[PDB]
Fold this protein.
Amino acid sequence: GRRTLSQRKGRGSIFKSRSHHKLGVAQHRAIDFFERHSTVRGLVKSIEHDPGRGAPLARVVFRNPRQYGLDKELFICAEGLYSGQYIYCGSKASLHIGNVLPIGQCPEGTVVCNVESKPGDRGIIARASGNYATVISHNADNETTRIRLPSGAKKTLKSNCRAMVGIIAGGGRTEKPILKAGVAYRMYKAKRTTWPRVRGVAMNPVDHPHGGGNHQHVGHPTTLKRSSPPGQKAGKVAARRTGLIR
Amino acid sequence: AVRVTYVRKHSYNTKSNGIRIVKTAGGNMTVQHRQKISNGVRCGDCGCVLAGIRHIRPHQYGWLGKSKRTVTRAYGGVKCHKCVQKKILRAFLINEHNLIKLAAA
Amino acid sequence: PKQVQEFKQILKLLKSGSIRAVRVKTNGENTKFKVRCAKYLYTYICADKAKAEELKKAIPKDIHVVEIAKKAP
Amino acid sequence: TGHKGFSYKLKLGKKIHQNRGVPQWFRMKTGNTINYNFKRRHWNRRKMGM
Amino acid sequence: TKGTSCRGTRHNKTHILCKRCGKRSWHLQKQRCASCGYPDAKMRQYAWGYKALRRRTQGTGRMRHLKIALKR
Amino acid sequence: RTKKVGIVGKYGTRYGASLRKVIKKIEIAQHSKYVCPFCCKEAVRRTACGIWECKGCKKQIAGGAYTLSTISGATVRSTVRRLRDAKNSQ
RNA sequence: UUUCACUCAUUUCGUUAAAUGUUAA
RNA sequence: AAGGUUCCUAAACAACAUUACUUGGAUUAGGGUGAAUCGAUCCUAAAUUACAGAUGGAAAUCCUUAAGAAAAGGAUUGAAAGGGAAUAAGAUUAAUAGUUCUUAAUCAAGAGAAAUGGUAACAUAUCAUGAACUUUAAAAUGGAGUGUGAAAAUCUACGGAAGAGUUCUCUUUUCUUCUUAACAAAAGUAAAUUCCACUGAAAUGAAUCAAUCAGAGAAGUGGAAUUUAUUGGCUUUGUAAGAAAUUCAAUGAAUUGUGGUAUUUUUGCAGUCUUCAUAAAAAUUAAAGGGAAUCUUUUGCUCGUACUAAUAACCGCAACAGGUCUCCAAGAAGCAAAAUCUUUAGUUAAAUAGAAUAACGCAGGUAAGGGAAGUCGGCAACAUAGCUCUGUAAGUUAGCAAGAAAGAGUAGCUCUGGUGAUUAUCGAAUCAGAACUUUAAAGGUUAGGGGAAUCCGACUGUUUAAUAAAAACAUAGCAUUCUGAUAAAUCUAAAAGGUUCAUUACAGAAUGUGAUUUCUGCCCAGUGCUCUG
RNA sequence: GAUUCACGCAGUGUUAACGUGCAAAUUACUUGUCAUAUUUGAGUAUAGGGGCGAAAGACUCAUCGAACUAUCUAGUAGCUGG
């Protein structure tokens, strides 16, 4: 047989990210003394639309604390931020929407976004539009805090992980039903080349494991092991359940 | 109804390939290479087009008179008159407010 | 090609040392004094015949003068 | 094309130079078998692949 | 339309003349010569191409500076 | 001019009655003006998904994809204020 | 062998390797 | 782009262009391609390749700033359609011309305690000092549709000059020319937008085709700025009439007003709509914050430049009815860049002709009476067809069906009235109405056959280049599975290797069904998958 | 991602012409379509148990249910011809 389309995707030839008009990398500024033992003030110059993502990006301009000049960052807009706003980042920042504080200073029940999964990595969790993470508890013995991930899973992180207070803007993006195939075509203008998906059963046995015979069907169970080799791994992987839920 | 031809070797109607057809002696129509439309300066704060500066190409400002590319004012040529008035009030009022708040208030 | 507007500069222009050649053209109604200098070709239009003569008394004798009329030279 | 590199034009010119025939005096040498130039081509007959 | 009609759009060169072998074998997009093995320092020769070896090799040219050395 | 297909009357008769009714709520709220939280003028209009600009006020506000403020984005702003006030005092 | 504590190879990251740790203040 | 001397001239016609050739894109021999201003050269985009390093048995692969004692900061290449300093008119050659000649310019690199004015928006033939460092702006950014300024083309009113056509029947008639560059100047005078000063709006006003705006301030008056194909948009001026065009004479003479409430094209401007789409970067330039320090003339190098750009110069074996990216664009008529005819330009030859006018053919037609009785099948042909008024069913996702179906009118000549601007004249095609006449009028060309049902696919869309265009594929909708990112999928022999990922569960990856409505029944024995056992 | 006409494009029908053709897939009328899931030039990326595919085993230089080219190779033939 041939190589299935999933195999061809890892090569990255026509499936590369269409990132040409993208604004940049959206993350917190590098952690330093002024972000660890003081506060820095940032001015939200503008709010812009980053292609390929559902949330607006804000151009924040911090003054350089060690040298003379500016220091331009690119934050992700928390819902409610406006142009000309002042945002403060540091271990002593005020607990307002848009400020950046270590996850160990927020009280229990605080809603944060753009959480660092490891201190100094500048943003991993809760980054999609309308998403957020909640603070569950603190453990001052080992300086670790528990937060609830947007998927519902619970994670343990060090209290030094910075985070931005609030929820990510652009909420309710996926609630609008796509109506036309053209609208779905324009969704991936800054994404991968994956939209028009041909059913495996509609192909031939060479191309796909589902390539059927005189009747369009699968013929073998579509729940497979995780250890299945690439090429034959299709459908559901390590599925503990199937069907509809009542 | 005199029909003309491209004078240069460009054969496509790109932005840099703008042409205007003018008349000449004997009813002759020639081809003139017309320039592109350029934007003006904007205030660095509000993004509004400043008044008193022409909208020409960046190299053409070198040929302009030294007094014909800027406005005689503080932060003139980079900020609007409104962009500067708020700067003066911010620089003054904030300085006065903290002059009475700390240092043995 | 530039154009001078009155007498006070053309006499000043002629009395300067930057002149190169002068062509005087007698049109149907007016007369043009196209003084060719190093850079430009300054011209002056006169409707008075007498005022034109005063210019011709001021032309330096060490320069070339060309007469142009209804027939090309 | 109208536009060409300097080296390409000189190799174009040499192809013009080599599209000639045997001079008459050369054909009159003793024991001569060279009467025609079999390396000849015409623009509408064969493209020179360059 | 895979025959006569599809040949009309062929006006873009794939190979141009190479600098080391002089043949129209320099691939413009691949940036290598199919014949003499350009920028690769070693000349491109293969045992399966025995005829390709007897067309361009030592002794097929002028031998400007080696004819005297072996004669000497 | 219409009876019940107000703004989704441009879709004609080719997307399903339910799907046109669902998108009616979004399409009305997407193209509607909102009260500016600073100058209190009904001038805020959408520019991109999640970005709103006050036309006669010179401000840009981050918000929901189709509404200026979402329900989930409003209870969060009140929740933070309550925690902030409690944290400051004892 | 198992169960713990450390770092010292090692894994994964961040920067203009730009105030880490301990004292004085 | 591709071709490569096919371009021009002369001699010559053995061969070639399915006859012939004095012709030739064919033979022979000469000649022809001129740039400071047009491009390459310069910059970067997708992407591409080096030293050192990492990997590999190996060739070699990876990395492109991360690993480096390498590069104030990040190497090489990458566009004759992206960005970009500066040239136009006339004439000339058998052929080159934004390239030569005349005339007229432009640009770059050189050389010879530091200003006023306006309340303000802001303004001053260089002017009126401004280093390191930092910032801002420009280069530099989608599409649609509406309104409008300006130029050109076409059309038209007024006043002529010159030439040509018609003229036995008339025609104060019909036709042609009446022009102007780059670069600069500033008599006169526009449209639109944004700001500034006075004053403070409600009895709310102001405004557009639509909108839209106002006490963080409307309308009014008076100013300022920018754009409008070079200076400053239009007329005008220098250029510049000496050019060029139309005439006259045998080189020499004549003239070259003013408009339009018309159409199209181009070009800007102003707001409106639209996106789960937001629609490049660098070279290079200017300004600001800051306060360190105390007109003339010279040069402007390398390369391309001829010709076709196609029913004969390109790709298809060819002078092949196939294919191949663009620029400029007249009149009639009409809704129309439609069909049809003509003007400027091009051509009359583009695989040979003459005679006769048999059958069978290819292309275009017509037909007595009947009207699908032919045939697998109304296949092929016939038939309806523009515009205006009336009128329009079941069904329905309430949007449609719908140009449903059906009926009436339409010509020519002579008139009448409506739709405006300026204080009677001026101008636009459009609508309606009335007599009279005839061959009773959309139909020269262009130009929907209609209705009642059944099956499949929901729809717009894609598909077996060369026998299958479809009920097949896609699609939005529904649903399922895994993954906290050192992950999931997955390329590589390996790799501080690679893709989704400039990403982070409203996400990534893997699948089935196929809009909307209604409903998704019972079974965990077997085979898969899973388990915290 | 409404209905149509036009410049263009495709290839529904005649299963017309042609079928030692204009053409190793073309011509005429008819039909469909004729801007947003649009058409298109150049640059660039993806390569053979590989690529690309709105999926026909389609396309990958007139070559595809595994391209072209050279070597193993004068591959083997209980089969056919001499």
